[PDB]
Design a protein around this ligand. Structure first.
Ligand SMILES: [Cl-]
Ligand SMILES: [Cl-]
Ligand SMILES: [Cl-]
Ligand SMILES: [Cl-]
Ligand SMILES: [Cl-]
Ligand SMILES: [Cl-]
Ligand SMILES: [Cl-]
Ligand SMILES: [Cl-]
Ligand SMILES: [Cl-]
Ligand SMILES: [Cl-]
Ligand SMILES: [Cl-]
Ligand SMILES: [Cl-]
Lengths: 258, 258
């Protein structure tokens, strides 16, 4: 539906980088999560990265792990997540919606049925976070068949071989994480290979990291856990939670004008 | 085959905690990896946790991520991993072998065929690191049908409800990661619910953390990345690599007598 392409062209109009918050769907409840997402959008978030609750405790930090636990504790299921996605899309027809999920989600229903469901509710992109590039073909092909952008991660030490693969396979945006190479170097190479615009997603904790990413040439930044941390710290006061989310998104967008 | 039960009873004879190193199969090559594993065993490792190369770059630290990349760069496939596992078991018939892997590995062949292959090569336990407990039943049942211990992770804030589930579902050992609760408290509750012996697996970097785990009552410790770091730092000298691995395992076992 051109949602990412239109966003990045309009961000070019505004001379801004994208700010894309991550939240877990259904954290800390279905309705609070919907209102958290409305607040992020109203405060200036350019796109959304939304997680279907998963479990990766060996690797995840306490923030993301606790969010997954809060959503499961609220009884959140993939079914409810897809209904939430549909509602978000209906209220916000133009905002790019990226799903972040883990491979076992597609076991119960099958790869094509999963991507068909994404297409039906209006998702724009899907990142299956735990599938190596060597095993990505069935996901990439199913995504394209259903008009979904498959998101590929560019790791910090990617050689030109891998950069060429990431640039060619992905659509929508490139999820950049940056024997690491210089940030500006990865960005330049991805542009040389006509990759989808790069969103720096590593360690985007606060305004300084957004500004650094845009100054290095990235198209924007993805905040992997900073929004979830504000949720966790304000669980007892939804009003203060929403106010802190607004000031945070505002400060992150200010950094995106750097 | 009683490999974990026999190990823990013999560790009780020795008044020792278990030390269980993690390595990625095929890192930095098939034959170097086999010899790394032989060296860990000869140096005193009590069991093995072996990873089939995966990809979890959003969450993994550089050590584990780089190991996965080194193994894929050596052309390692799941097929070669299963042959390596078979060779390790043939050379070392009594040592408990735990596989650590990610869910997409079971997509290509199916859940039952994966666990059948594990049983055939002599694996004792399987931890599918990225499957929530709410979705674990098909894996747990397939494991039991093939005489494989399914490994469950006890997270640091587990309530008694979850502790009861982890204690009942798992076999072999409990993979302990420790609003977190006191380490000794989780250990006590797991014993109260007759869980498989707990191996503390969070942050086991050096001897101090092994000693802390055993002093708190854990049956031992799993070093998630410390062995891989020694591999990465000594890639240019296999001889020095193996010598540093020996001194490291020796120091970790010394801490396990605490
Ligand atoms: Cl679109
Ligand atoms: Cl529940
Ligand atoms: Cl290169
Ligand atoms: Cl695109
Ligand atoms: Cl950087
Ligand atoms: Cl982060
Ligand atoms: Cl056994
Ligand atoms: Cl290769
Ligand atoms: Cl409780
Ligand atoms: Cl057992
Ligand atoms: Cl601790
Ligand atoms: Cl670790």
């Amino acid at each position: 539906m051109e949602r990412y392409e239109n966003l990045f062209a309009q961000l070019n109009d505004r001379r801004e980088g994208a700010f894309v918050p991550f939240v877990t769907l259904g954290d800390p409840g279905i309705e609070q999560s919907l209102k958290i997402i409305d607040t992020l959008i109203d405060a200036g978030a350019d796109a959304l990265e939304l997680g279907v609750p998963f479990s990766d405790p060996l690797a995840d930090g306490p923030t993301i792990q606790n969010a997954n636990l809060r959503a499961f504790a609220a009884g959140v299921t993939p079914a409810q997540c897809f209904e939430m996605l549909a509602l978000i899309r209906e209220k916000h027809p133009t905002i790019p919606i990226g799903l972040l999920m883990y491979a076992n989600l597609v076991f119960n229903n099958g790869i094509d049925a999963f991507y068909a469901r994404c297409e039906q509710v209006g998702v724009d992109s899907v990142l299956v976070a735990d599938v190596p590039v060597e095993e990505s073909a069935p996901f990439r092909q199913a995504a394209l068949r259903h008009n979904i952008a498959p998101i590929f991660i560019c790791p910090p030490n990617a050689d030109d071989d891998l950069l060429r693969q990431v640039a060619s396979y992905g659509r929508g945006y490139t999820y950049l994480l940056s024997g690491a190479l210089p940030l500006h170097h990865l960005i330049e190479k991805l542009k040389e290979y006509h990759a989808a615009p790069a969103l720096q997603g590593f360690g985007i904790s606060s305004p300084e990291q957004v500004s650094a990413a845009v100054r290095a040439g990235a198209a924007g930044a993805i905040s992997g856990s900073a929004i979830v941390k504000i949720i966790e710290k304000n669980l007892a006061s939804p009003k203060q939670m929403l106010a802190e989310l607004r000031s945070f998104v505002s400060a992150m967008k200010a950094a995106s004008r750097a």
